From a paper:
Using alpaca immune libraries against the receptor‐binding domain (RBD) of the SARS‐CoV‐2 Spike protein, we isolated 45 infection‐blocking VHH antibodies. Single‐domain VHH antibodies (also called nanobodies) are derived from camelid heavy‐chain‐only antibodies, whose antigen‐binding sites are composed of just one peptide chain (Hamers‐Casterman et al, 1993). Infection is initiated when the Receptor‐Binding Domain (RBD) of the SARS‐CoV‐2 Spike docks to angiotensin‐converting enzyme 2 (ACE2), a plasma membrane protein of the target cell.
The long CDR3 loop greatly contributes to the shape complementarity with the RBD surface. Binding would be entropically disfavored if, in the non‐bound state, this loop was flexible or adopted a different conformation. Remarkably, CDR3 comprises three highly exposed tyrosines critical for RBD‐binding, although they should have a high propensity for getting buried. This suggests a strong stabilization of the loop conformation. Extensive interactions in free Re5D06 stabilize a CDR3 conformation (with solvent‐exposed Tyr 104, 109, 112) that requires only relatively minor structural changes for strong RBD binding.
Author numbering: 1 to 127
Write the structure that this text describes.
């Protein structure tokens, strides 16, 4: 029942900024992760960032730390990825994905695998 839709892709010049949106519908669980991923030309898909619903905790991939920020509008069921200081090598299809957190002992663990994916949005950083 979960569906995710990415939007906001476009063409931007080197050094520019862009904000992506991931709108989710059908989520009923309280404890879940939303991840951003990307696949560049010639490369495998890689993780970009993730956020969890319980407390808003995040993580970012080494290549984007400080330049990209992932955040939420709970009333719109939406997560944003704000990208600043864009580089040519940030060019990719960007995807968002959903996966439940799972509890063991006293802690909720992030998933390795995500269950539902959007169709992606193209981000091109080029002169």
């Amino acid at each position: 029942q979960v569906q995710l839709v990415e939007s906001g892709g476009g063409l931007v010049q080197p050094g520019g900024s862009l904000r992506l949106s991931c709108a989710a519908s059908g989520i009923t669980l309280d404890y879940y992760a939303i991840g951003w991923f990307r696949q560049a030309p010639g490369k495998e898909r890689e993780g970009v960032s993730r956020i969890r619903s319980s407390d808003g905790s995040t993580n970012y991939a080494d290549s984007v730390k400080g330049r990209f920020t992932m955040s939420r509008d709970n009333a719109k069921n939406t997560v944003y990825l704000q990208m600043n200081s864009l580089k040519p090598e940030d060019t990719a299809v960007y995807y968002c994905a959903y996966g439940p957190l799972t509890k063991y002992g006293s802690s909720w663990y992030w998933p390795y695998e995500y269950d539902y994916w959007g169709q992606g949005t193209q981000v091109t950083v080029s002169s």
